[PDB]
């Protein structure tokens, strides 16, 4: 018995950033094969007034939720009030918020195409290789020298229109 609150960590985005992100996700899930298993949840299904949208991306047994926000009270003097994103990794009534970097790395484990264990040796042997990493967004920290070395040699695949990356949403 007292006011209860649920509290979130929210990174801010410039308005156009959301529109780009939204069009990319909707584009790749429905208009291409790549992101289809992802789910996009509109603003009206969502019980919170402040939720601009959500993208539920299953990773194995646990799922990632990317939440976009509306009419928020941070970052602007404008009438629409401006907005943000938050990200969570959810399994069986457990939650953790996740930062944009890790969000992308985590998405990437389960989704887009990369080098296989064969690729690094085959590159050495001249046997050539498939496939190549798309989604540069998937590699963050620093890198194994091997990975980066390979990276000097094989530039990432470069999809159009680009696949969704949350770091790109939160950049600047």
């Amino acid at each position: 018995m007292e006011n209860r609150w649920q509290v979130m960590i929210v990174w801010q985005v410039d308005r156009m950033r959301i529109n780009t992100w939204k069009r990319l996700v909707k584009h790749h899930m429905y208009i291409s094969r790549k992101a289809k298993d992802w789910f996009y949840r509109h603003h009206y299904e969502s019980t919170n007034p402040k939720i601009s949208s959500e993208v539920h991306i299953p990773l194995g047994d646990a799922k990632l939720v990317i939440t976009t926000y509306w009419g928020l009270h941070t970052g602007e003097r404008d009438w629409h009030l401006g907005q943000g994103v938050s990200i969570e990794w959810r399994k069986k009534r457990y939650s953790t918020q996740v930062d944009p970097d890790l969000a992308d790395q985590l998405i990437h484990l389960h989704y887009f195409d990369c080098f296989s264990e064969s690729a690094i040796r085959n590159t050495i042997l001249g046997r050539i290789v498939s496939p190549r990493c798309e989604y540069q967004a998937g590699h963050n920290k620093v890198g194994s020298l091997q990975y980066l070395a390979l990276a000097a040699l094989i530039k990432p695949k470069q999809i159009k229109p680009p696949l969704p990356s949350v770091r790109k949403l939160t950049e600047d």
Partner: protein, 87 residues
């Protein structure tokens, strides 16, 4: 505290031990029979390798601003091989 890694071209490199222990292979070679001798890898390689060692020790701990360790395309194949051996 320091250990020394040698190039075929006869160049000598001195680097901190904890920096070197980045290399798992080097972590093994140091066991038993300091200083260590590399046959297949040239000097322009071991230099660059020491550079990555430091780069890693520095930016792995604190992720705030992390810059693009630079690698030139011709050095790249030789470097990849060298990395595959050491790491």
């Amino acid at each position: 505290m320091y250990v020394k890694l040698i190039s075929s071209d006869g160049h000598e490199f001195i680097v901190k031990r904890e920096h070197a222990l980045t290399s798992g292979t080097i972590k093994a070679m140091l066991s038993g029979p300091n200083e260590v001798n590399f046959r297949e890898i040239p000097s322009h390689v071991l230099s660059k390798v020491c550079m990555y060692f430091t780069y890693k020790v520095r930016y792995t701990n604190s992720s705030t601003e992390i810059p693009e360790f630079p690698i030139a395309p011709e050095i790249a194949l030789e470097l990849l091989m060298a990395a595959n051996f050491l790491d």
